[PDB]
Amino acid sequence: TRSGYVVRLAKYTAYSALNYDPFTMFLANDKRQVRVVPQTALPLVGVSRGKERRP
Amino acid sequence: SDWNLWVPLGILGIPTIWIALTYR
Amino acid sequence: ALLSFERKYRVRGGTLIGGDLFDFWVGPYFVGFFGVSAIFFIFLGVSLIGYAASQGPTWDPFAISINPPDLKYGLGAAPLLEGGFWQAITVCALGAFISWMLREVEISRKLGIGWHVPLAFCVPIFMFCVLQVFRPLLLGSWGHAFPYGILSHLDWVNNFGYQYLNWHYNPGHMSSVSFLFVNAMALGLHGGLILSVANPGDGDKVKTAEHENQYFRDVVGYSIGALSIHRLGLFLASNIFLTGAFGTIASGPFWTRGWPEWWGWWLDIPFWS
Amino acid sequence: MYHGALAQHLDIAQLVWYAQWLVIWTVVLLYLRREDRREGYPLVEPLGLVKLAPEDGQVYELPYPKTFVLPHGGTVTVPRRRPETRELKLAQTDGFEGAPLQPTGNPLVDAVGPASYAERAEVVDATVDGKAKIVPLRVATDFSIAEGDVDPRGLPVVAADGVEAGTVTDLWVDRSEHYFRYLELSVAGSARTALIPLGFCDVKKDKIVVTSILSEQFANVPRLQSRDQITLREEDKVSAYYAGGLLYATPERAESLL
Amino acid sequence: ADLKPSLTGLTEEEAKEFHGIFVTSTVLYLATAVIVHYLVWTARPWIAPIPKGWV
Amino acid sequence: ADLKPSLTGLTEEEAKEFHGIFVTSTVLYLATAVIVHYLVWTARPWIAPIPKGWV
Amino acid sequence: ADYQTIYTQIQARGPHITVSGEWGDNDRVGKPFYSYWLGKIGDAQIGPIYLGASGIAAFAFGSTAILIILFNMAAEVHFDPLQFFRQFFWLGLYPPKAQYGMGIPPLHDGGWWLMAGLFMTLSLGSWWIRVYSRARALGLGTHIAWNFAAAIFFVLCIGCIHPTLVGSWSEGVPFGIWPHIDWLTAFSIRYGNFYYCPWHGFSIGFAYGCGLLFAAHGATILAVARFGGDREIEQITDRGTAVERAALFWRWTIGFNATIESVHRWGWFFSLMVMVSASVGILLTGTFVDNWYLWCVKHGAAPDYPAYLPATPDPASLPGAPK
Amino acid sequence: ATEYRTASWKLWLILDPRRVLTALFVYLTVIALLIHFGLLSTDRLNWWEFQRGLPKAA
Amino acid sequence: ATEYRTASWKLWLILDPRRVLTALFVYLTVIALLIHFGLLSTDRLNWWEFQRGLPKAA
Amino acid sequence: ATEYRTASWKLWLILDPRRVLTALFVYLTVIALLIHFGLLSTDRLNWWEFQRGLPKAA
Amino acid sequence: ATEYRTASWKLWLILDPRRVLTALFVYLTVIALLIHFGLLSTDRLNWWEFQRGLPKAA
Amino acid sequence: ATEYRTASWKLWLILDPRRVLTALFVYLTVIALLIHFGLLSTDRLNWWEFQRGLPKAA
Amino acid sequence: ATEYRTASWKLWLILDPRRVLTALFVYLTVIALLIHFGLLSTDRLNWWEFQRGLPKAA
Ligand code: BCB
Ligand code: BCB
Ligand SMILES: C/C=C1/c2cc3[nH]c4c(c3C)C(=O)[C@H](C(=O)OC)c4c3nc(cc4[nH]c(cc(n2)[C@@H]1C)c(C(C)=O)c4C)[C@@H](C)[C@@H]3CCC(=O)OC/C=C(\C)CCC[C@H](C)CCC[C@@H](C)CCCC(C)C
Ligand SMILES: C/C=C1/c2cc3[nH]c4c(c3C)C(=O)[C@H](C(=O)OC)c4c3nc(cc4[nH]c(cc(n2)[C@@H]1C)c(C(C)=O)c4C)[C@@H](C)[C@@H]3CCC(=O)OC/C=C(\C)CCC[C@H](C)CCC[C@@H](C)CCCC(C)C
Ligand SMILES: CC(C)=CCC/C(C)=C/CC/C(C)=C\CC/C(C)=C/CC/C(C)=C/CC/C(C)=C\CC/C(C)=C/CC/C(C)=C/CC/C(C)=C/CC1=C(C)C(=O)c2ccccc2C1=O
Ligand SMILES: COC1=C(OC)C(=O)C(C/C=C(/C)CC/C=C(/C)CC/C=C(\C)CC/C=C(\C)CC/C=C(/C)CC/C=C(\C)CC/C=C(\C)CC/C=C(\C)CCC=C(C)C)=C(C)C1=O
Ligand SMILES: COC1=C(OC)C(=O)C(C/C=C(/C)CC/C=C(\C)CC/C=C(\C)CC/C=C(\C)CC/C=C(/C)CC/C=C(\C)CC/C=C(\C)CC/C=C(/C)CCC=C(C)C)=C(C)C1=O
Ligand code: HEC
Ligand SMILES: CC(C)=CCC/C(C)=C/C=C/C(C)=C/C=C/C(C)=C/C=C/C=C(C)/C=C/C=C(\C)CC/C=C(\C)CCCC(C)C
Ligand SMILES: CC(C)=CCC/C(C)=C/C=C/C(C)=C/C=C/C(C)=C/C=C/C=C(C)/C=C/C=C(\C)CC/C=C(\C)CCCC(C)C
Ligand SMILES: CC(C)=CCC/C(C)=C/C=C/C(C)=C/C=C/C(C)=C/C=C\C=C(C)\C=C\C=C(/C)CC/C=C(\C)CCCC(C)C
Ligand SMILES: CCCCCCCCCCCC[N+](C)(C)[O-]
Ligand SMILES: CCCCCCCCCCCC[N+](C)(C)[O-]
Ligand SMILES: [Fe+3]
């Protein structure tokens, strides 16, 4: 039942509307980094603009 | 190049003519 | 020390408690019994903060904090440095607030105006009481209340909210937030509209009440009307806390799951599930 | 190497912070607060010592004057010097700066404390057309009560005593707001109509209850100059009388609860 | 008030001159639409026959 | 009041002067469009024939 | 109680007078009707409405936007009508999920997002013009327009400007009830906690400020409504007992007062400032500060607390840690 | 009537061209947009794009 | 009544063509849309798309 | 009429140039934007950019 | 009353046909939808779809 | 009264048919809904579906 | 008309320069900006930067 996807997803993440399946992203394999927050006060030159940056 | 892809000419063209002709 | 028109209004009486002995103005301030009382708390409470902050680990104004006692102390008194002063201040606080509010009542009595102001001021007081007193009673510890500290207090707000997994979804919050926004927008419009009519630019004549009406009935097609906006303002403002108070009290005593899970009621009606 | 770094400890955010502050205070002080002193300033002194200048920093204080060009002719200049020359019937408790005052005679008639009015311009309030704004329903014949409400015309006006003061003659309407401002009642015992603000009476199904003043003092509600229109000053006069009664109707209204 | 625009009405004659054109032009449009639909059909025949599985 | 401009009608002539230009330029606009659509076709023949799989 | 401040007891009906504009007296639209219930809190009469060009346009773009939004939301539930209606708050139109920098993203990943964005932008503007023009049409001042302006600008900041300065559309707010909110958290997590950004501070200050101020102004007027203090404009030009009292009240309490006119300025100023403060913060973020907390620690503003349970060294940094 | 068979036309006495015209304009445009959009959201029947349909292929 | 059987027609004296016409117009459009979309939400009975139905196959 | 065939012109009596013009102007603007941007967010029929299409290539 | 047995009919002097008519119209419509859609959200009694009801089968 | 036994009827002089009618309409509808849906949310006592009950079965 | 062929000029009677003129100003400014910016968002057709285009080169 194709219409039910969103709900199938929500119930997995505590009923929030977040749109990612975190099993397949983080748990199935070691391919992603969980850490997203920068470890410095100011934007570090060379990783902080455009296609250098993460989404 | 439009080969039996008259389609847009059809849509664009047909009304263009009867617009010209109905309101005189 | 007086406004040009002030004198005719400065008459005796209309104190709630203890008559004539406190019925005087210091400068522009009217004192009264509650004046005195307020001051006393303010002075003591503030001093107490200072002393307490002195035996902290910093003096950065943002970084200073007076925290409440651990959860083990229950609803009892704690050692003075291990949460006691917190307790102290909280009372001086309440003290000050209430004395403030009553003073206002005395003032309004003296002027023969309505008591709307004091009462309106009662709403936030209540929310303070809700957060510092009731909710902690219901969970049975003072340690559930928030600490006094500019940045410190926010840390409390922050963690509290992540204790239910995403506070944004808590329906009390939703309502309160909506009001907060409407209120702000509405103040803007009310502000502007008066000002536009008064100061119409150039040597244009000041406009009439009808122009206020026309203006809105043009832009959005309805005009709430002049008195009622005032009335309505008061209403919006007030439900910021009135509705929120519900969401606040709920979290912990009446709900222990994440707030999103609560919308399950709708999401899960078995008909269309 | 970092974006937004002015030194090894100084960053553009940090500077902006102060900047922001600066503006706020400036606006507040060098503007808003000045705008606030358009009424009732400069400050007056009836005890203190040789002072033509408020809290200090402030005799600039007053902003330079505006000039409101009014809708139906004329100009007003703000701030002004509007002098109070009514001679107040108030004796002082002490000669002291901020010690309160005692009314000498009847405070409700001598118009002091909550019973004091402002000396407004002695003209009729007007519509955008040039008609009178506030009129009774004898005059505004086009206007009417909404179907579904109680017409208070005919009802008994009961005062603070529990005694019928008189009966309702009319309602008065604001023509430019579609709103009722006054009840005009017929004070029983005399041959007079007095005007009560609608904010001083709880209208019921059977009666109009007036907590403000006592039955006997309806006899002394300020008299209207004309019969069918009301000036701006007369409005203030009428309103102040009842409100003054909230402190002066009974002797106990003075006193504190204990 | 004893007329159709009875004693200075805000004005609309017995104009079915409008009705004429309205109906003409509405039909032209529906015709053109058919012609068009035919053409597109030849480019992308859209309904499809019932497949091997179905039912 | 028994006319088109019957006792100050609020200011529009019998102007088919406007009907004139309006219909003129409506055609030019559509004309130009056809031409232009043709040129583009030669640069990017957009609809495409049906692929080997399809149906 | 005094009932006359809470609701209206006796309602009035009669002929409403139209103020003739500078232009477009003609483009007022609809039969004005009454609502007796609404009449208990404000004017009962509900029509007409001005139309004119700006309107037309605003609606034009606005609707297109809405359409694109909804349509894509439908497409998320695969057009099942029942499910749509059940799942509606959880549905949204999202910006791009891959990193394309600032390139116009593919239709299926953020493309449609962008289009709706542009159209929403355009409606806002068209509307702005409406507000501003109408004012000028009726010989009023332009204050409302300018307040409204700031609001719009802040929308711009979080919509495209910020994305731009950091140079990725990925940072856009999504359309949809819940999902516009999920944005808030993500965004905050990413920039190292927004409670610690000073402009978030300012903003909130002013916002609560508005609360305080309206409650106060609101309450004040009602308290003096008995003297006809709700007639705010005549009070400006010819000061009556009403506002004399109102002033006195505040003076005797906090020790300084306003005027009937200037209180409006204060309110107008506070309102404005919410939006401005916000905009600044947004602009600074990502561009000059990467992690607001760490920044507050570099300037020692951040409070520090002792450990309750034992302090925990990050496992990543141990000898012989995995990845 | 000018050689009419039915009263049909009397509709315009009742209804108002202006409202009808303007409504149709909108109505049609919406339906039009919907259909267009819905088409360009498929995999058959998206012109404007390489056949991502993977028609049967794989 | 011009050669009539019932009074039915009197309804138009009570109800008002304009209301009815307009509302029908809307009502129908809705239902129409509901069905259309609803159908194109399935697997059997979607035209506009490849047979994703996987009718039984696998 | 100045040597016409139809009443067509009379529309401008009923309808109003100003509003028609102003509308059309917005309307066409909307559509033009839709088309341009929509196009430039494809892979075929993007001019402006290098052929990202990877038409079959790869 | 034209050979009527009851007074039933006087109801329309009390009630207002226009309200009744309009209410039923809506009322019914809704129930109808509930039933349709609700049915088509089961596994048995869904026409429109393949029997992914998998009735007992597997 | 036309051949009555009680005065029951006088109720309608007091109470108002239209209120009672409109209320009952609603009241019963709601109750009806509660029961219907309520039932169809069980395991026993759901028509409309395959026997989810697993009645004793496992 | 001062040696004119069309009535076209009458548009200014109907339309008002002040408005036309000003709106145009805005309009044009927007389109300008959209294009300029849009362009400098690409890789081909961005001046103001090195050829990030990596035109085929990597
Ligand atoms: C991660 C956690 C979050 C969170 C956690 C949260 C909690 C736990 C609570 C709220 C609450 C509220 N939140 Mg939320 N919040 C809100 C807005 C709001 C407010 C509408 C509302 C009430 C604020 C309050 O309690 O005042 C407090 C003000 C008080 C108590 C009055 C103090 C005034 C006092 C009487 C007088 C003081 C006088 C001074 C001492 C005098 C000193 C001055 C000088 C002159 C001497 C917005 C708009 C957002 C956005 C935009 O995201 C947001 C996000 C969040 N909130 C985050 C998601 N929020 C409250 C609420 O209502 O929840 C439903 C609340 O409990
Ligand atoms: C976990 C995340 C949090 C968070 C995340 C956050 C972010 C990221 C931002 C804020 C911002 C703000 N926060 Mg915060 N927040 C706030 C309150 C505020 C506001 C004062 C300010 C946002 C400006 C605003 O009013 O938006 C409402 C007003 C808006 C959106 C303007 C709308 C006007 C527009 C013209 C509307 C008209 C639209 C049209 C009708 C169009 C219709 C659409 C069609 C076309 C489809 C409170 C009171 C709290 C509490 C009590 O905790 C809190 C906590 C949090 N915030 C949590 C910590 N907040 C902003 C800010 O100030 O940052 C520095 C901001 O960017
Ligand atoms: C919905 C209803 C809204 C609303 C309504 C109204 N608001 C009013 C009134 C109305 C009607 C008044 O009539 C009254 C007033 O006079 O008009 C100016 C008032 C006032 N609202 C103030 C602050 C205010 N309003 C807030 C919120 C809303 N207002 C909501 C939004 C907030 C928020 C939201 O944070 C703040 C900070 C003061 C300026 C002023 C009272 C001074 C006082 O209370 O004197 C007495 C006390 C002092 C002067 C100092 C107290 C020192 C104590 C003893 C100990 C130190 C404090 C300790 C508790 C540490 C905490 C700090 C920590 C968090 C880091
Ligand atoms: C501190 C400063 C505050 C502030 C200030 C101010 N805020 C203002 C003004 C000022 C000064 C105005 O002057 C202006 C206005 O005029 O108000 C009277 C306005 C506004 N702020 C609105 C909403 C708002 N303010 C918010 C916030 C703050 N504001 C902040 C907090 C928020 C939040 C917080 O979310 C919200 C939601 C709107 C009322 C209004 C925009 C109208 C518009 O821009 O129109 C744009 C036009 C549309 C979206 C078209 C509508 C199309 C319809 C729905 C049909 C679509 C259906 C379609 C599928 C099919 C078509 C068929 C169809 C026939 C069916
Ligand atoms: C000289 C002499 C004899 C000396 C010896 C005597 C001696 C030493 C005696 C003993 C002293 C004693 C016993 C006592 C000391 C005095 C005393 C009682 C002090 C209390 C003082 C105290 C704690 C003061 C702090 C003031 C305070 C709490 C807050 C400051 C105000 C703040 C921050 C307000 C928020 C900002 C804000 C909303 C500003 C709004 C602007 C204004 C003015 C809003 C109010 C306002 C509104 C809202 C209107 O609607 C309005 C409508 C129409 C006209 C006017 C107004 C108006 O003014
Ligand atoms: C006079 O000059 C002026 C005018 O006239 C010329 C104007 O018209 C105007 C303004 C022009 C206008 C058109 C004004 C209209 C502008 C507006 C923003 C009006 C819009 C207001 C709303 C949409 C209402 C807000 C509703 C929301 C934000 C949604 C909230 C969502 C939920 C779920 C709320 C749930 C809870 C509730 C709805 C109510 C809860 C209430 C309680 C729990 C308790 C209630 C408390 C009371 C009743 C008070 C206590 C009772 C007494 C004290 C007697 C101005 C500015 C000007 O001043
Ligand atoms: C002459 O000098 C003085 C003045 O003039 C200068 C004064 O005005 C005043 C002021 C005195 C007044 C009564 C002012 C008028 C009264 C009011 C305005 C009402 C508001 C007053 C209050 C809310 C509290 C005042 C009463 C007290 C502080 C009594 C203290 C009671 C106790 C049990 C203290 C002993 C501590 C314990 C037994 C430990 C266990 C108790 C706790 C842990 C509670 C603390 C935690 C909380 C959340 C507090 C919440 C409870 C409350 C706020 C009542 C004083 C005291 C002074 O003498
Ligand atoms: C059971 C323990 C646990 C709980 C509960 C938990 N987290 Fe985490 N969280 C972690 C761990 C472990 C990591 C780091 C994982 C890694 O190194 O890959 C983490 C990482 C994070 C990060 C990334 C920090 C960074 O360095 O970029 C955020 C943000 C976060 N958590 C937020 C949350 C939120 C919000 C919740 C509650 C909803 C939550 N966490 C609940 C263990 C937990
Ligand atoms: C005297 C008078 C004033 C002067 C004359 C006035 C003049 C000249 C009038 C003539 C000029 C003009 C502009 C005439 C215009 C006539 C027009 C526009 C007729 C339009 C008819 C439009 C029709 C019939 C539209 C029917 C639309 C439908 C049936 C849509 C159905 C949609 C569905 C079933 C859902 C499908 C959705 C899906 C996703 C599959
Ligand atoms: C006042 C008078 C005296 C002076 C006279 C002065 C003059 C001559 C004024 C008139 C001169 C001018 C400027 C006339 C202009 C006439 C114009 C602009 C006519 C325009 C007609 C435009 C039409 C018919 C547009 C039809 C558009 C559509 C059908 C679009 C359909 C779009 C879709 C189906 C979806 C595409 C979107 C997608 C696939 C994402
Ligand atoms: C240079 C190039 C190529 C492009 C530039 C494009 C550009 C200007 C981008 C900037 C975009 C901006 C400003 C984006 C802003 C996005 C924002 C702020 C979104 C925020 C919130 C949206 C929310 C909460 C909306 C949710 C919407 C819905 C649930 C559906 C919409 C429907 C309604 C509101 C109801 C009305 C419909 C009813 C009549 C049937
Ligand atoms: C964080 C936002 C708060 C901004 C500060 C508000 C200004 C308060 C007004 C003080 C008035 C000073 N005074 C007594 C000279 O008038
Ligand atoms: C109200 C928001 C709190 C955050 C404000 C940050 C304060 C900076 C001033 C502290 C001095 C230290 N500094 C900046 C030189 O490093
Ligand atoms: Fe006001």
mmCIF file of C-alpha atoms in Angstrom, chain D residues 89-90 102-108 110:
data_model
loop_
_atom_site.group_PDB
_atom_site.id
_atom_site.type_symbol
_atom_site.label_atom_id
_atom_site.label_comp_id
_atom_site.label_asym_id
_atom_site.label_seq_id
_atom_site.Cartn_x
_atom_site.Cartn_y
_atom_site.Cartn_z
ATOM 1 C CA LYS D 89 -11.190 73.119 46.647
ATOM 2 C CA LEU D 90 -8.525 70.906 48.251
ATOM 3 C CA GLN D 102 -8.316 66.596 51.537
ATOM 4 C CA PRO D 103 -11.390 68.017 49.752
ATOM 5 C CA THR D 104 -12.769 71.093 51.611
ATOM 6 C CA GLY D 105 -16.448 70.925 50.529
ATOM 7 C CA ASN D 106 -18.331 68.336 48.475
ATOM 8 C CA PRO D 107 -15.667 66.671 46.287
ATOM 9 C CA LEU D 108 -18.245 65.552 43.661
ATOM 10 C CA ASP D 110 -15.958 70.783 43.516
#
